[PDB]
Structures are given as structure tokens and as C-alpha cells.
Design a protein around this ligand. Structure first.
Ligand SMILES: [K+]
Ligand SMILES: [K+]
Ligand SMILES: [K+]
Ligand SMILES: [K+]
Ligand SMILES: [K+]
Ligand SMILES: [K+]
Ligand SMILES: [Mg+2]
Ligand SMILES: [Mg+2]
Ligand SMILES: [Mg+2]
Ligand SMILES: [Mg+2]
Ligand SMILES: [Mg+2]
Ligand SMILES: [Mg+2]
Ligand SMILES: [Mg+2]
Ligand SMILES: [Mg+2]
Ligand SMILES: [Mg+2]
Ligand SMILES: [Mg+2]
Ligand SMILES: [Mg+2]
Ligand SMILES: [Mg+2]
Ligand SMILES: [Mg+2]
Ligand SMILES: [Mg+2]
Ligand SMILES: [Mg+2]
Ligand SMILES: [Mg+2]
Ligand SMILES: [Mg+2]
Ligand SMILES: [Mg+2]
Ligand SMILES: [Mg+2]
Ligand SMILES: [Mg+2]
Ligand SMILES: [Mg+2]
Ligand SMILES: [Mg+2]
Ligand SMILES: [Mg+2]
Ligand SMILES: [Mg+2]
Ligand SMILES: [Mg+2]
Ligand SMILES: [Mg+2]
Ligand SMILES: [Mg+2]
Ligand SMILES: [Mg+2]
Ligand SMILES: [Mg+2]
Ligand SMILES: [Mg+2]
Ligand SMILES: [Mg+2]
Ligand SMILES: [Mg+2]
Ligand SMILES: [Mg+2]
Ligand SMILES: [Mg+2]
Ligand SMILES: [Mg+2]
Ligand SMILES: [Mg+2]
Ligand SMILES: [Mg+2]
Ligand SMILES: [Mg+2]
Ligand SMILES: [Mg+2]
Ligand SMILES: [Mg+2]
Ligand SMILES: [Mg+2]
Ligand SMILES: [Mg+2]
Ligand SMILES: [Mg+2]
Ligand SMILES: [Mg+2]
Ligand SMILES: [Mg+2]
Ligand SMILES: [Zn+2]
Lengths: 104, 124, 208, 150, 83, 138
RNA sequence: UUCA
RNA sequence: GAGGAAGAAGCCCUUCGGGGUGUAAACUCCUGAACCCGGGACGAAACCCCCGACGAGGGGACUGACGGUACCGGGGUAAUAGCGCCGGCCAACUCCGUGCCAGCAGCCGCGGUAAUACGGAGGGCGCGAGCGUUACCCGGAUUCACUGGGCGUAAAGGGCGUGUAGGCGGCCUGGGGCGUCCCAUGUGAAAGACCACGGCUCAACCGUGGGGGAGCGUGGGAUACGCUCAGGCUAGACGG
RNA sequence: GCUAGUUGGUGGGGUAAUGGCCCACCAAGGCGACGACGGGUAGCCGGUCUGAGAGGAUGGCCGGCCACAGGGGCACUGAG
């Protein structure tokens, strides 16, 4: 079975390519508490169709580029930028923790 | 620590530091003597404990106890170190094995012979 | 080497008589007679209450010194028993009583366990028909334990096997003085053995 | 009838002008090996009087141990002060696996199979007191039964 | 070029082989494709040679190539009998 | 505000009985009610029933103890000697039916929530299923 | 002054 | 190996009456590792050859390093014992030497003239073709605590807020079924581990067979709790 | 905090074959506190030792995979 994942598009900045963020849930090995983990996958969109806030299914695909081993299968819901937001805010934090800072 | 905290930072493994850097952990290690002084014990004890600085193969120079009634170590004696602390001499963490190399086994020894490297005298 | 040395001395260190001889440790001489105190230059003076440990050690020492076995074989046996199901205690004894060298004694072909051990070694014994010289050999239920055809006519066999004519034997054994054979019916139940040992302690010795 | 086991005896001393004045303490157990045990801590000017005093007290302090065939009915963990004691049932052919103190008590309570563990402060006095409570605290189906019946 | 050969098992002087299917290139005691029989040349036991013929016949039918000795033992188990 | 309403219930019951109270209210939630069914059935609590303390619905929980006792401290032996949460927010706990615990060699119980409903340890075991392990009681 |  | 004294000599101890080493030895009788001689392996039946059909079958020959080894039968001598401990933990005590020396020492601690702790001796305790030592791993150590710990004074509450990420989330109903639970099924090599039989006289070693299971994949199923999406509520919160 | 083969696109080249694997040209992109980048250390596993277990420690023998063949680079031949 070619793996099929489901995530949110969080970047339409590539020609025929989109970043999909996939949320993985599971109990922590030793401590039990069900923890949340996640990864971004660069999926293949040939007709630059899917766009941010989009929730789509990603399917294991034949290589397409160094980093692209997934084509965008179909689309589930859409436009829900609340997620894309969550992702962005977080990334924005990074500018604070370092040598400089960033108010909250 | 909340379970969340534990997930977040988890526990810290306790590494134990060795009390015998005769490098390689190695059972024993050898070197040559650099000095063969004697020292005084501490706290309540008194005596003239015999010791020896040793230029080790592990590339170290440590002070080592010379167990036994009497010894025969001089400026350039080659001996095998084995390590064993000596409570009465701060700084003395290794023992010199008697019966190996230039360290002669204590003679006239009749009991704990295998230690002090002494061959069995024949019952005549 | 199987011990080899003063024997009617282990007898008195355990404060109990040990038949580590047989014919003599029976008639007014096992020393346990007018000499039941421990061996040594101090053996007479009164002892101090033994430590739970001490008490536990001396007991393993009895049992082990009874069967005349090295601490190594002893320990291996115990462990073998530990593993096996069922009261991993009486099973230990079950095993012990299964050693050929022992059965040969229990069957009377030998006077003592030590003397029984030499018979096996010097191939004077025959399990199920074939010769065996391994005292540790384990006897299973049904194994015929005869006397070597050629050894059957030996001076000590007659003597020993003679006194047996009449004498009753273990409810788990059975012999045939005539043909000089004998058979291991089954592993003895704790009830079957009359031993100066509280196995429970030997177990509590290894638990430690 | 009743068997006595001496868990420990210590010397202890109270200072006083002129010097130290000593006085011995003794913990002893009493049990019929029939499911009854009593703990006693006696103290006196001399060891013997102390042991005597102890024995006397153990009888005044008995407990009914619900033996379910050489073993305990259910697992129990009792905490006495800074001392914790764990009692777990064991099938036959195991024996009593415990530190000298818990054992002495368990053995005279006529327990032949049981698993245990000393946690926290290993203070004899307090571990002895812990197992007593653990025992004094064991229930049985019958008990739970009458207790839960409306 | 897969084979049906003997793999050594047992101990020093106690040789017990495992008639196996394995690529022509593995160690003789390496990872085989399937065990299909077993052989004890000393024949200490009454049963010193077993050979799942249904299976040997399979591999033979697909290109398996038996050692000459592997063939011998396999014959005894009438792998080739066609009566 | 309450973080673990179930933990709360359990605890109100623990606290109440320690001082030996008659009943003891506890905010109503079906889940909590399903928990009580078991406590009642197993014979840990006299029983329980709805009530409307000031409009908002509660659940009187009628506690149950033993009989007055001898010597000093005549206080009755508790029927609920122990009641403890297991799964908790931020450390949820589950179990395969092959992993459902035997509380006090059976003398106790372990209420656990399965996809077949809230069942006791043996209940859920009987009809072979597992789920979130709610708590243990004895 | 050390050591009991 | 079985006998063998109210008990040798020596050695140690002694209140000198005696005690210990101890049935231990001597000695008597029995067996007979070593070693001598005789026989002597399985592991090796194929490829090949003839018949038949260069098939199936059936006959036939060759080939053993190990090794004259294992094993068998006969003969046959009483034929190595060490090492570590004995203050407590921790099984095992007494004399003499030494006098804070010479030395021991895992930890606690012994030695300053009566040392069960040093060194010797006698005796004793453990093991035994081994016994001790050092080095290293896990254990005890719930002494990094998930199971299974703590933070007033023992080590430990951040000097105080605001608040980002994250963690956590009251009451009712409905959809989904991500976590969670269930059935089925594929996978989970051999060896090892467990069990049962077996082969070497036993065992170690070995063979055969048996039972495993988590994890992950696939197909179904459940929906209490958690998650999510919808919609309500007022008891939390905020506002008037 | 790291990154111009970096991330992607188009067309090629190359190989048994996908691929920034390598080119030409066009896009600005890609990754990071669910720890990028950097430093240290280490072949991975079946398993082994230990532990009541959870866990800890290991990876010699033997079996599987990988990597290297004085150190660095390279291609030829060939089913490889
Ligand atoms: K940045
Ligand atoms: K001494
Ligand atoms: K350790
Ligand atoms: K502070
Ligand atoms: K391209
Ligand atoms: K591992
Ligand atoms: Mg491309
Ligand atoms: Mg932890
Ligand atoms: Mg060293
Ligand atoms: Mg000094
Ligand atoms: Mg001193
Ligand atoms: Mg040391
Ligand atoms: Mg009762
Ligand atoms: Mg406490
Ligand atoms: Mg503590
Ligand atoms: Mg409670
Ligand atoms: Mg001093
Ligand atoms: Mg003799
Ligand atoms: Mg043949
Ligand atoms: Mg042959
Ligand atoms: Mg022809
Ligand atoms: Mg040839
Ligand atoms: Mg012969
Ligand atoms: Mg002692
Ligand atoms: Mg010493
Ligand atoms: Mg040996
Ligand atoms: Mg730990
Ligand atoms: Mg904890
Ligand atoms: Mg603490
Ligand atoms: Mg302070
Ligand atoms: Mg403080
Ligand atoms: Mg403060
Ligand atoms: Mg500050
Ligand atoms: Mg928040
Ligand atoms: Mg909620
Ligand atoms: Mg689901
Ligand atoms: Mg499976
Ligand atoms: Mg396997
Ligand atoms: Mg056999
Ligand atoms: Mg097998
Ligand atoms: Mg291309
Ligand atoms: Mg590139
Ligand atoms: Mg991540
Ligand atoms: Mg390396
Ligand atoms: Mg543990
Ligand atoms: Mg542990
Ligand atoms: Mg390997
Ligand atoms: Mg290279
Ligand atoms: Mg080289
Ligand atoms: Mg080169
Ligand atoms: Mg080519
Ligand atoms: Zn005797």
C-alpha cells in the first residue's frame, strides 16, 4: 500500500509544488501521555491547484525531485487557515530565542 | 515533575566516574619508578608508608603503594601497577603488584602469599 | 576430588551423626558417640547464637555433606530444581536421590556413599544392562541397576550384598539379592526420606 | 503453643552528670504459626528483663492473619512512618522471601509463601510495625463479602 | 542457480546436515531459502534422513540444482521414483 | 474550574467517607452516573440518585460503612478502603483486554471505560474488551 | 598541644 | 574404598589434672586412574561403470586427514592439593612475636606491651584443579523514581508580574472514527531463549519436535473516554 | 540558526531505473526549539549480560545487513 497521508498546505511558493504539514498522534513510549508530532512533506501539484489552508491527502509517489516523493492525491476540506496560522506563529517565535529577542 | 515535564525533559542518566585512570580501564598498567619516598598516614594513624612515583605506559605519573613487609624498589625500577586505594594516604589510588617485574615478592611470607607474589616454600 | 579427608569430623561440626562411613558410623564409634561437639581446639566451649545466615549455611552444609558432592554440582542441581515446576525444594532432593552413585548405596551394593561412588567409577555397576562409571548419572524410573557380570563374583560385593538378604529397602526402589540387580521404581517423596535436613533453609540460603 | 522470636536488641544510652546511663531495648515476636502473631518492644535496665518485658507485650498485641494456604489473600503495601513494606502472595514452593525482620513476623504468623520488599527507611522498629499493620489489615473474600452486602 | 545442498549443523565429530534450498553463493552454513530435509550420516537415531518430497519436487521443478550427495539422500526418499 | 470531574467525584467520595458522612453531592454528568451504577452494583455505596441542589443537577451519593467497633477508636471499617484515579488528563491510560489488571486478587475492582460502555474489570473481560482504565476501587 |  | 585407639610420634594449647590436630596417620584387607598387550570404528555412498532408455529403477567399483584415535576385551600400580579467609558486615580463635613501629585495611576501622584485625604458628571456616586479585557491566540503588521519589526547617518554589508557544479543559445531543478497544489475516529467517523427547556411558555439546509474542501491513467491527466537526446550555470566566 | 545545486520548475545529459545524480536557463525557495546547523562518540541487528519487572548495559564468537582493503581520486572490462 502506497502510504497516503493527510495534512495542511502551508506554502504555495513553489512552481508545481506545495508543503504539506502532517500531524501524527501517538502515546509516548515510556511516559504514556499521548503526544503530538508532525512533519512537512513536499507534495507534487502539477496544475498548481491546491492552495494554503487546504487539507489534502498525500500519497507515496515515484521520485520527482531531491525532496519530492509525494504527489497530492485529493482534497478534503479547504481554506482553513487557522492551521496555517498556528504553523506560522510558531515559526515566528524562532526570531526571539537566540542572541536578540521578540516581544509577546 | 509533571508527566508533561518528563516528556519535555525526561530523566538524566547517571554516569559514574572511574577511580582508577590507569587508562584503558585495563586490569593493570606498567611504568618505571621516578622516586621511592615514604609518607606519613593521616587523621589518627602514624607510620612511614612506603610509596613510589611511577611513569606509566598509559602516559601518566602516579604515586603507588608498595604493600609488603619490606621492598626493593629504586630510582629506575619497572613495576606493574594494579590500583587499590589506601585510606591513610590521600593521593595513593594504585597498588604496586609484588612479584611482577622488578618488584620482588615479599620473602619469608607464609600466609597471604598469592598476594605479595611469593612462591610456595616446600615443607621439608 | 570428592572431599577426601577427616570425615567423622563433618559429622560433629554439624552436631548430628552423618553416615559418611556406614559400618562404623553405626556401632559405638562414629565419634558422635562421646564426642558430638564440633571439631577443633575450641569445639568444646559453648557457642554464641548463630546468625540466621550461619544457621542457613550449616544446613546446606549438612545436606551437601550427606551426599558427598561439590558445591558446584550441588548448586547446579538446586538451580535445575529451581527451574522445574512443583515445590522446587523436595524436587531438589528428588534429583539428589537420583544420582547413580547414591542409588548404588541406597540399594545396598555399597556400604557408604563414598564406597558407592568408587564402585561406579571402577565400572563395577550396570544400568539397564550397559556399564556406567558416572556417579552423577541420573537414574530415571524403571532403570535396572545391576552389578557388573564380571564384578558380581567380587569379594566385597558378596559381603555387602549378603547383609542385604533380608534387609528391607526404600519404598521407591526394590532389589533382587539373588541376581544382584535392582530397580528404580520412582523418585522419592519428601515423606519417603528421613533426613536431618530442613530443605526449606537450603532454599533460603540461595535466595539470599 | 506460642513461639517467641527476638527481632533485635539494642543498648541505647541517656547522658547524665557523671556519665552515660544505659538501658536496653528488645523487639520480639510471638506466633502460633497458626495464623496468630504479636509484636512486642520491651525496654529495661538489663537485656533479659527487656526481652521478658517484650514477650509479655507481644501477647498483649496479637493479630489474626487470614492465611489462604501458607500465603496471604491479597497484595498489600503499608507505610509506617518513613518505612514502607510490600506484601505480595506467592504460590507454594516459593518460601518466605523477606528481610530478617518481616520474615520473623511472617514465619511465626505461619506464612510459608510470600514475596516482600522493604522500601524507605529500613528501620527495624518501624518495619516491624509496618508489617504488623499490613497483616492486621488483610481482608478476605468472606470479609469483603459481608462488608459489601447491603 | 539455486541449490539443494547440505548445510552443516551439530558439533565437532557430531555432523548433522540440513538439506536446504539456498542460492549457490551463500556460506554453506549461511542463510538458506528453506529447509527441506535433514541428514545424520552416523545414523545415531533410527530416523537419520527425512525429506519433504512434496517440496524437493517443487524446487527441482523450478531450477533448484542438487549436489551429487544432496541428490543421493533425496533419491532414498524416492524424490525421483516414478513407478 | 474542574480539570478532572471524575477525579473530583472519586475524591469527594474519598473525603466524605473519611469523616463518615451520610450522603454527599457531586455535580451530575452521565459519565459520573455510569461510574456510580458500578459502585452501587458492586456494593461499595449504599446507592445514589439525582437531585437539584439550587437548580443545577447533582447526585447524592449515599455512602456505606461497616459496624461500630471495639476498644478505642470505634469508628467503622470503611467499605471503600481505597478509590484511586488511573487514567488522567495529560496521561491517559488504556489497556488491551489482555492487560486489564486483577485488583487485589479479585477482592477489589477496576472500573474502566470501553467502547461497549463502562464496565468492571471482569465485566469488560467477560465480553473481551478493554479501554481507558478509569480507576481502581477496593 | 596530638591519639584513645 | 572399608576397617583401624578412649587414641602413637610430632606440633599447638593448659587453670598443667587435661584438651586439640583425630580414625587423621601407622597397619590390615578390597578396588585399580596411570601404564602394558590384543582387536579396532561410524563418519562413505555418491560422481563413475554395466543393465535398462546417458530416465525410473537395479547392480558394481573407488575413496578416511582425523587415527591406530574413540570404543571393546585382558593385564595392572594406592597413585597431584592447592588458594583465600577467621574484629563487624560475614561461615571460622588461641599462643607468641612485635610496641602509632613494622604493617593491615572493601566500608566501618586495627597497631602507643596482654593485638581474635600486624607477622608467624596451631586450630578453624569456605571453595577445590583450582583459589584469590585488579579492571569493566547490571544488581541491591524506588540513589533520575514510567512502574517508583521529592522541594517550610535536610539538596530543591523561579524576586514579582504580563503573557507567546505548548500542556490541560464544565454540562447536553448529533456526524465523523484520529487516539483507544475487538475479530480476522500477512509479516515476525536460521541460531539463541522456554518445553518435550532423543544422540555421545552422563553432562557440557548436539539433533528433532512443540509453544510463543510485541511491533508493523491489510480487511472488517465497536464508539464509552480522548480528538474533531455541528448545534444547544449556564454552574467556570468575563461584562452591566 | 543553517542553506546559493541551496528548494522547486522547464529542457537536457546520464544509468537497468526514479532523482539537482550532473548540466543549461527560470523561479525564490528550502530546513529549524516535535532541536536545524555545529562539536563529541559509535558500524546497525538477530542476540548477549543483568533485573521481579519496567529498565539498564552491550553487540566478542555464530547468522543477516553495511562499510573498508596503506591514505586520496578515477574509470575500464563485465550479468554483476
Ligand atoms: K530566523
Ligand atoms: K591473629
Ligand atoms: K552499581
Ligand atoms: K531562592
Ligand atoms: K530535470
Ligand atoms: K538492544
Ligand atoms: Mg523534476
Ligand atoms: Mg524516567
Ligand atoms: Mg588501572
Ligand atoms: Mg603525609
Ligand atoms: Mg592509629
Ligand atoms: Mg579497591
Ligand atoms: Mg481477619
Ligand atoms: Mg513518607
Ligand atoms: Mg534511604
Ligand atoms: Mg483512596
Ligand atoms: Mg594516633
Ligand atoms: Mg581411611
Ligand atoms: Mg556406510
Ligand atoms: Mg567409514
Ligand atoms: Mg546402455
Ligand atoms: Mg572423488
Ligand atoms: Mg581395562
Ligand atoms: Mg562470625
Ligand atoms: Mg591480611
Ligand atoms: Mg572442574
Ligand atoms: Mg534504578
Ligand atoms: Mg514518578
Ligand atoms: Mg529523595
Ligand atoms: Mg541551612
Ligand atoms: Mg534548604
Ligand atoms: Mg516566592
Ligand atoms: Mg532572577
Ligand atoms: Mg494558551
Ligand atoms: Mg471535555
Ligand atoms: Mg480509528
Ligand atoms: Mg501478528
Ligand atoms: Mg527465530
Ligand atoms: Mg541421554
Ligand atoms: Mg528447536
Ligand atoms: Mg530527466
Ligand atoms: Mg543537489
Ligand atoms: Mg518533527
Ligand atoms: Mg569507529
Ligand atoms: Mg529492582
Ligand atoms: Mg530496579
Ligand atoms: Mg557476526
Ligand atoms: Mg578507502
Ligand atoms: Mg596494514
Ligand atoms: Mg591506493
Ligand atoms: Mg559496461
Ligand atoms: Zn561419622
Amino acid at each position: 500500500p502506497k502510504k497516503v497521508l493527510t495534512g495542511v498546505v502551508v506554502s504555495d511558493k513553489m512552481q508545481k509544488t506545495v508543503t504539506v504539514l502532517v500531524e501524527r498522534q501517538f502515546p509516548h513510549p515510556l511516559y504514556g501521555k499521548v503526544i503530538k508530532r508532525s512533519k512537512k512533506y513536499l507534495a507534487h501539484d502539477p496544475e498548481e491547484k491546491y492552495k494554503l489552508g487546504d487539507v489534502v491527502e498525500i500519497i507515496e509517489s515515484r521520485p520527482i525531485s531531491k525532496r519530492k516523493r509525494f504527489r497530492v492525491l485529493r482534497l478534503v476540506e479547504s481554506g482553513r487557515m487557522d492551521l496555517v496560522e498556528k504553523y506560522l506563529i510558531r515559526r515566528q517565535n524562532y526570531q526571539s530565542l537566540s542572541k536578540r529577542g521578540g516581544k509577546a | 515533575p509533571t508527566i508533561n515535564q518528563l516528556v519535555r525533559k525526561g530523566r538524566e542518566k547517571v554516569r559514574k566516574k572511574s577511580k582508577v585512570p590507569a587508562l584503558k580501564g585495563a586490569p593493570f598498567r606498567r611504568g618505571v619508578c621516578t622516586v621511592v619516598r615514604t609518607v606519613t598516614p593521616k587523621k589518627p594513624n602514624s607510620a612511614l608508608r612506603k610509596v613510589a612515583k611511577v611513569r606509566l605506559t598509559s602516559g601518566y605519573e602516579v604515586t603507588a603503594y608498595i604493600p609488603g613487609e619490606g621492598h626493593n624498589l629504586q630510582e629506575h625500577s619497572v613495576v606493574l601497577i594494579r590500583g587499590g586505594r589506601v585510606k591513610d594516604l590521600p593521593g595513593v589510588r594504585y597498588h604496586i603488584v609484588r612479584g611482577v617485574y622488578d618488584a620482588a615478592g615479599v620473602k619469608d611470607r607464609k600466609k597471604s602469599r598469592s598476594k605479595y607474589g611469593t612462591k610456595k616454600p616446600k615443607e621439608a | 576430588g570428592r572431599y577426601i579427608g577427616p570425615v567423622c569430623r563433618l559429622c560433629r561440626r554439624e552436631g548430628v551423626k552423618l553416615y559418611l562411613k556406614g559400618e562404623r558410623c553405626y556401632s559405638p564409634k562414629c565419634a558422635m558417640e562421646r564426642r558430638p561437639y564440633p571439631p577443633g581446639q575450641h569445639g568444646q566451649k559453648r557457642a554464641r547464637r548463630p546468625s540466621d545466615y550461619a544457621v542457613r549455611l550449616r544446613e546446606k552444609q549438612k545436606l551437601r555433606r550427606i551426599y558427598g558432592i561439590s558445591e558446584r554440582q550441588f548448586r547446579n542441581l538446586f538451580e535445575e530444581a529451581s527451574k522445574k515446576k512443583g515445590v522446587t525444594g523436595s524436587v531438589f532432593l528428588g534429583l539428589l536421590e537420583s544420582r547413580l552413585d547414591n542409588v548404588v548405596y541406597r540399594l545396598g551394593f555399597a556400604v557408604s556413599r563414598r564406597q558407592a561412588r568408587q564402585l561406579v567409577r571402577h565400572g563395577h555397576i550396570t544400568v539397564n544392562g550397559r556399564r556406567v562409571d558416572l556417579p552423577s548419572y541420573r537414574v530415571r524410573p524403571g532403570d535396572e541397576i545391576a552389578v557388573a557380570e564380571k564384578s558380581r563374583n567380587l569379594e566385597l560385593i558378596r559381603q555387602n550384598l549378603e547383609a542385604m538378604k533380608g534387609r528391607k529397602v526404600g519404598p521407591w526402589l526394590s532389589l533382587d539379592v539373588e541376581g544382584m540387580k535392582g530397580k528404580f521404581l520412582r523418585l522419592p517423596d519428601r515423606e519417603d526420606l528421613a533426613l536431618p535436613v530442613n530443605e526449606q533453609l537450603v532454599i533460603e540460603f540461595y535466595s539470599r | 503453643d506460642f513461639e517467641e522470636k527476638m527481632i533485635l536488641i539494642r543498648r541505647t544510652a541517656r547522658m547524665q552528670a557523671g556519665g552515660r546511663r544505659f538501658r536496653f531495648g528488645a523487639l520480639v515476636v510471638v506466633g502460633d504459626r497458626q495464623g496468630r502473631v504479636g509484636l512486642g518492644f520491651g525496654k529495661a535496665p538489663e537485656v533479659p528483663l527487656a526481652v521478658q518485658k517484650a514477650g509479655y507485650y507481644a501477647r498483649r498485641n496479637m493479630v489474626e492473619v487470614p492465611l489462604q494456604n501458607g500465603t496471604i489473600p491479597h497484595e498489600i503495601e503499608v507505610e509506617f512512618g518513613a518505612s514502607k513494606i510490600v506484601l505480595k502472595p506467592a504460590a507454594p514452593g516459593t518460601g518466605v522471601i523477606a528481610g530478617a525482620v518481616p520474615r520473623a513476623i511472617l514465619e511465626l504468623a505461619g506464612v510459608t509463601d510470600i514475596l516482600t520488599k522493604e522500601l524507605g527507611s529500613r528501620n527495624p522498629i518501624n518495619i516491624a510495625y509496618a508489617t504488623m499493620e499490613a497483616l492486621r489489615q488483610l481482608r478476605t473474600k468472606a470479609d469483603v463479602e459481608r462488608l459489601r452486602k447491603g | 542457480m539455486v541449490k539443494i545442498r547440505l548445510a552443516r549443523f551439530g558439533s565437532k565429530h557430531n555432523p548433522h546436515y540440513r538439506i536446504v534450498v539456498t542460492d549457490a553463493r551463500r556460506k554453506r552454513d549461511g542463510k538458506y531459502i528453506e529447509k527441506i530435509g535433514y541428514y545424520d550420516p552416523r545414523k545415531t537415531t533410527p530416523d537419520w534422513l527425512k525429506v519433504d518430497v512434496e517440496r524437493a519436487r517443487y524446487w527441482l521443478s523450478v531450477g533448484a540444482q542438487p549436489t551429487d550427495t544432496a541428490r543421493r539422500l533425496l533419491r532414498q526418499a524416492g524424490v525421483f521414483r516414478q513407478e | 474550574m474542574l480539570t478532572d470531574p471524575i477525579a473530583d467525584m472519586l475524591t469527594r467520595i474519598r473525603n466524605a467517607t473519611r469523616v463518615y458522612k451520610e450522603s454527599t453531592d457531586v455535580p451530575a454528568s452521565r459519565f459520573k452516573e455510569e461510574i456510580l451504577r458500578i459502585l452501587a452494583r458492586e456494593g461499595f455505596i449504599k446507592g445514589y440518585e439525582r437531585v437539584d441542589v439550587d437548580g443545577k443537577p447533582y447526585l447524592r451519593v449515599y455512602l456505606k460503612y461497616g459496624p461500630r467497633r471495639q476498644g478505642p477508636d470505634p469508628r467503622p471499617e470503611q467499605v471503600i478502603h481505597h478509590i484511586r484515579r488511573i487514567s488522567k488528563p495529560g496521561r491517559r491510560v488504556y489497556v488491551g483486554v489482555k492487560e486489564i489488571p486483577r485488583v487485589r486478587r479479585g477482592l477489589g475492582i477496576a472500573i474502566l471505560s470501553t467502547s461497549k460502555g463502562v464496565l468492571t474489570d471482569r465485566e469488560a473481560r467477560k465480553l473481551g474488551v478493554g479501554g481507558e482504565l478509569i480507576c481502581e476501587v477496593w
